[PDB]
Amino acid sequence: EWQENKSWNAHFTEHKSQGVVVLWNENKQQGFTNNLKRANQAFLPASTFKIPNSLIALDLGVVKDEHQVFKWDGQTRDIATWNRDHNLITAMKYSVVPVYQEFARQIGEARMSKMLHAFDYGNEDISGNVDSFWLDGGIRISATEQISFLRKLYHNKLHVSERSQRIVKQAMLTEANGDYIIRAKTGYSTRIEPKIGWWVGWVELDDNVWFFAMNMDMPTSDGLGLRQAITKEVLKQEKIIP
Numbered sequence: 001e002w003q004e005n006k007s008w009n010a011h012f013t014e015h016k017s018q019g020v021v022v023l024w025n026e027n028k029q030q031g032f033t034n035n036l037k038r039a040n041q042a043f044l045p046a047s048t049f050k051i052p053n054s055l056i057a058l059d060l061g062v063v064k065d066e067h068q069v070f071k072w073d074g075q076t077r078d079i080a081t082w083n084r085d086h087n088l089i090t091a092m093k094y095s096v097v098p099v100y101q102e103f104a105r106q107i108g109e110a111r112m113s114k115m116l117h118a119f120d121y122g123n124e125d126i127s128g129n130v131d132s133f134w135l136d137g138g139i140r141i142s143a144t145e146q147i148s149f150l151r152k153l154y155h156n157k158l159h160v161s162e163r164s165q166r167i168v169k170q171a172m173l174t175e176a177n178g179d180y181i182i183r184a185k186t187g188y189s190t191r192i193e194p195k196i197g198w199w200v201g202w203v204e205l206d207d208n209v210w211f212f213a214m215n216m217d218m219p220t221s222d223g224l225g226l227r228q229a230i231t232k233e234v235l236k237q238e239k240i241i242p
C-alpha cells in the first residue's frame with residue numbers, strides 16, 4: 001500500500017535540505033514516499049490549517065460565502081498583502097493569518113474541537129489559544145494524515161455540507177493549464193522547532209488524481225519557494241506533470 005522511493009531524496013539533498021514528499025495515486029490506491037518515518041511524523045499544520053478552518057467557518061455561517069469581505073483592522077503588519085481587505089479566496093491565497101484568527105474566535109473552542117474530531121484531523125488537539133493553536137498550540141498532523149483528510153475533502157465526504165467543501169476546494173485553486181489543475185495550500189511553521197514548510201493538496205489530470213503532502217526543514221524564509229519547486233520536480237520525475 002505504501003512504497004518508499006529513496007531516489008527522491010536527491011531532490012532534497014540537492015538543496016542542502018531534508019524533508020518528505022508523500023504521493024497518493026487515487027485510481028491505483030497506492031502511496032509513495034521518500035521517507036516512511038518522516039511521512040508519519042506529525043508537525044504543526046500552520047497555514048495548512050486554513051483548509052479545515054475555512055470548512056468549519058463556512059458550515060457554521062461565520063463566513064457567508066467566498067465573496068464576503070473581511071475588512072483590514074487597520075493595524076500595519078509586516079506582510080504587505082495582509083494590510084488590505086480580503087475575502088475567503090484572497091485570504092487563502094496570501095495566507096492571511098489575522099483573518100483566520102477572527103474566524104477561529106467566532107467558531108470558539110467547543111465547536112472547533114468537535115469539528116476537528118468529526119474530520120479525524122491530526123491529533124485533534126486544540127490546546128492553547130483558540131486564535132493561534134495551529135501556530136503555537138498542541139495540534140499536530142503528519143503528511144500521511146494530510147493525505148487522508150484531503151482525500152475526504154476531494155470526495156465531499158467530510159462531515160460538513162457539500163457546499164462548504166466545494167467552496168474551500170475553489171479557494172484552494174493554485175494553478176491550472178491545459179495539462180493539470182493543482183489545488184493546494186502552503187504552510188510555514190516557525191514558532192516551535194523544527195521550523196518547517198508545508199505544501200499539501202492534489203493534482204487533477206484528465207483521468208486520475210494524485211494527492212500530495214510535503215514538508216521540509218525551513219531554517220530561514222529564503223527557502224520557501226522550494227516547497228513547490230521540490231514537489232514539482234518529483235511530479236515531473238514520476239511523469240505526473242510535464
Ligand SMILES: CC(=O)OCc1cccc(-c2cccc(C(=O)O)c2)c1
Binds near residue numbers: 046186188190191
Ligand atoms: C510562520 C511565520 O513565521 O509567519 C510569519 C511569516 C514570515 C515570512 C513569510 C510569511 C508568509 C506570508 C504570506 C505567505 C507566505 C507563503 O509562503 O505563502 C509566507 C509569514
Ligand SMILES: [Cl-]
Binds near residue numbers: 169
Ligand atoms: Cl474551481
